[PDB]
Design an enzyme around this catalytic site. Sequence first.
Site, PDB file in Angstrom:
ATOM      1  CG  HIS A   1      -0.385   0.126   2.580  1.00  0.00           C
ATOM      2  ND1 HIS A   1       0.109  -0.632   3.359  1.00  0.00           N
ATOM      3  CD2 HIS A   1      -0.075   1.362   3.147  1.00  0.00           C
ATOM      4  CE1 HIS A   1       0.624  -0.036   4.443  1.00  0.00           C
ATOM      5  NE2 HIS A   1       0.643   1.183   4.328  1.00  0.00           N
TER       6      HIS A   1
ATOM      7  CB  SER B   1       3.116   1.843   6.252  1.00  0.00           C
ATOM      8  OG  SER B   1       1.739   1.606   6.946  1.00  0.00           O
ATOM      9  N   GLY B   2       5.724  -0.382   6.153  1.00  0.00           N
ATOM     10  CA  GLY B   2       6.689  -0.658   5.224  1.00  0.00           C
ATOM     11  C   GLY B   2       7.793  -0.975   6.087  1.00  0.00           C
TER      12      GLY B   2
ATOM     13  CG  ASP C   1       0.026  -3.949   2.902  1.00  0.00           C
ATOM     14  OD1 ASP C   1       0.314  -3.355   1.707  1.00  0.00           O
ATOM     15  OD2 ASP C   1       0.058  -3.438   3.787  1.00  0.00           O
TER      16      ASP C   1
END
EC number: 3.4.21.7
Lengths: 14, 245
Positions: free
Chosen positions: B57, B195-196, B100
Site C-alpha cells: 500500500h 508502514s513498510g 500487503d
Amino acid sequence: GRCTKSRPPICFPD
Amino acid sequence: SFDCGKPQVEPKKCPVVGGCVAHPHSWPWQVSLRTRFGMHFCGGTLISPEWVLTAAHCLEKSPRPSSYKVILGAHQEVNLEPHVQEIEVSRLFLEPTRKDIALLKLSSPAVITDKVIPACLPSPNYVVADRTECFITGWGETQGTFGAGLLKEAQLPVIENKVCNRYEFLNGRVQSTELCAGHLAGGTDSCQGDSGGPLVCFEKDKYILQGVTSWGLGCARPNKPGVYVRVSRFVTWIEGVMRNN
C-alpha cells in the site's frame, strides 16, 4: 476501522 | 564485509508512539521511502544491496518506479546526514496473491557500510511464538510522545493470531499471513509513516526480519495490537523475484 500506517493513512469503514 | 542482521552500533533496546529514539545507525537496514520530490511517507527494509521490502500500500500513489526513491543510512526524518545514500527505484514487484508486501529493485546497488547493512530473512513458514519480544522501528507519528523527526524504536511482544483475532481484540480481521504485536494496555505502537518498515526479532546473534508494518485499528489503543505482514510466508516468493530479476 482498519487504517494503514502510511502517510497519509488508507482507511476502511470497519 | 558485513553480515546480514548484525548492527555495528548496538541498539538501545528500550522497554512510533512510545518507545524511544534509536542510537543512530543501530538499525542499518531501515529505509525511508520518498517520492521523487517528496518527504518521507513510509519505511522499508534493505534485504540485499539491490532490494528493499516494503508494504504494497506504500505504492498506492503511483504504479511507476520512477516516482520513488529510497534513503539509506539515515537518522533524521527530514535533515539528511552528509553520508546518506539516495537511490532511485527501478522496478516494483507486488506480492502476486495481493497481500500487503512488495519488493523494490534499486537502480544501483546500495554500498554496504557500517551504517547500511541488510536485514536477515527468516526460514520459510516460521511462526514467531506467542510473547516473543521483537522490535519495530520507524519515523512515523508519535501521538505526543517524544522523538518526533528522529528514528524511533519500540519493543513489543508478539500476540498469537488466535488471541489477536478474539472479539474484544481484532475480531477475526487478522490473516494467517499476518502477525500481531503490542501491549494490551496500549500506549506503544507503530503509527502513520511507519508502514513498510521492519519488525525484527533477535535470534542467537543477529536480528531476523519477521514482520512488515501494515495496519491497525488506530495506533496504541488498548486491546488493539498492531498488525504486520508475516515475512516468513513470503520468503520463497522473495527469493524467486531476486533470482529471476
